């Protein structure tokens, strides 16, 4: 039981924030920020000085078919069916908020035959046909290794394909649902490079789940062997008392250390920090390292 000082946040202020909160409920859309109970809700939904207010619309309802021990998203054996109007409503809300870069994610839908690859592809297609110059990033589930489902999402005009390994291979069984493993997540990023050679790969790992420095170095080196372009490192924070406890709060100095090691291995940009999540300032990192 430890409580750190550098992981403290603020109660969400509602200057430019209720516009996003009321838009998500007008279209009956969900977001991973509210379900996962992220502390960076105020920073991402409301730019302090000059930060475009962005969000992470979570598709296919607020209930996941999997039960990951680090995630607080609701889990049910059979979630409600797909909403056909979700891909169309998402494209309207994103263009309404004036975003030049958007990130989209969804819960795992193991009950769907394609796992929702067609539903995600229609959300990106409706969003790119409406605004061709907008940048889209998809935080895609593993689809249980369905190479056809991964191909359908990667060929939807996607700019950055994102799928997280979450933690080191030695902690896949304790942290993630058994339907997801380390080698499976790498085959999601590898196949996205084969089907779409000009795509940008991106993944996110979490620290504080019992991993050591030796295990983290081998994971990043294996990701570079998978030709993964981008990497994200962040401190795992306990969502609820029912979930996993934090094992070790990584110091901000060591968080900066892995940023240099990522630059050594050749990662196009390594975003590391205690509060750094997968989509945390993802558009700001795109403008600083992925142009030229
Ligand atoms: C809910 S997942 C959605 C992607 C997809 N459903 C999957 O997991 O394969 C979105 C992100 O939230 C993050 N997340 C959930 N709970 C977290 C926590 N307690 N601390 C840090 N990150 C968390 C995970 O890292 C994950 O990458
Ligand atoms: C608490 O740590 C949950 C963090 C959720 C991060 C979402 S908003 C983006 C990956
Ligand atoms: S797959 Fe795991 S991390 Fe993703 S929404 Fe479901 S329980 Fe949460
Ligand atoms: S990193 Fe930002 S996009 Fe969800 Fe968390 S609030």
From Swiss-Prot:
Signal peptide region: none
Keyword annotations: 4Fe-4S, Disease variant, Iron, Iron-sulfur, Metal-binding, Mitochondrion, S-adenosyl-L-methionine, Transferase, Transit peptide
Compartments, record wording: Mitochondrion
Enzyme Commission numbers on file: 2.8.1.8
Known catalytic reactions: [[Fe-S] cluster scaffold protein carrying a second [4Fe-4S](2+) cluster] + N(6)-octanoyl-L-lysyl-[protein] + 2 oxidized [2Fe-2S]-[ferredoxin] + 2 S-adenosyl-L-methionine + 4 H(+) = [[Fe-S] cluster scaffold protein] + N(6)-[(R)-dihydrolipoyl]-L-lysyl-[protein] + 4 Fe(3+) + 2 hydrogen sulfide + 2 5'-deoxyadenosine + 2 L-methionine + 2 reduced [2Fe-2S]-[ferredoxin]
UniProt pathway annotation: Protein modification; protein lipoylation via endogenous pathway; protein N(6)-(lipoyl)lysine from octanoyl-[acyl-carrier-protein]: step 2/2
One cellular-component annotation, GO: mitochondrial matrix
Record GO terms (molecular function): 4 iron, 4 sulfur cluster binding; lipoate synthase activity; metal ion binding
Cofactor note: Binds 2 [4Fe-4S] clusters per subunit. One cluster is coordinated with 3 cysteines and an exchangeable S-adenosyl-L-methionine.
Ranges in coiled-coil conformation: none
Domain of life: Eukaryota
Cofactors required: [4Fe-4S] cluster
Binding sites annotated in the UniProt record for [4Fe-4S] cluster 1: 33, 38, 44, 279
Disulfide bonds: none
Gene Ontology process terms (BP): inflammatory response; lipoate biosynthetic process; neural tube closure; response to lipopolysaccharide; response to oxidative stress
Domain Radical SAM core, chain residue ranges per copy: 49-268
Family the UniProt entry places it in: Belongs to the radical SAM superfamily. Lipoyl synthase family.
UniProt disease annotation: Hyperglycinemia, lactic acidosis, and seizures: An enzymatic defect resulting in an autosomal recessive disorder of mitochondrial metabolism. It is characterized by early-onset lactic acidosis, severe encephalomyopathy, and a pyruvate oxidation defect. Affected individuals have neonatal-onset epilepsy, poor growth, psychomotor retardation, muscular hypotonia, lactic acidosis, and elevated glycine concentration in plasma and urine.
Name used for this protein in its record: Lipoyl synthase, mitochondrial
Organism: Homo sapiens
Higher taxonomy: Eukaryota, Metazoa, Chordata, Craniata, Vertebrata
Chain's gene name: LIAS
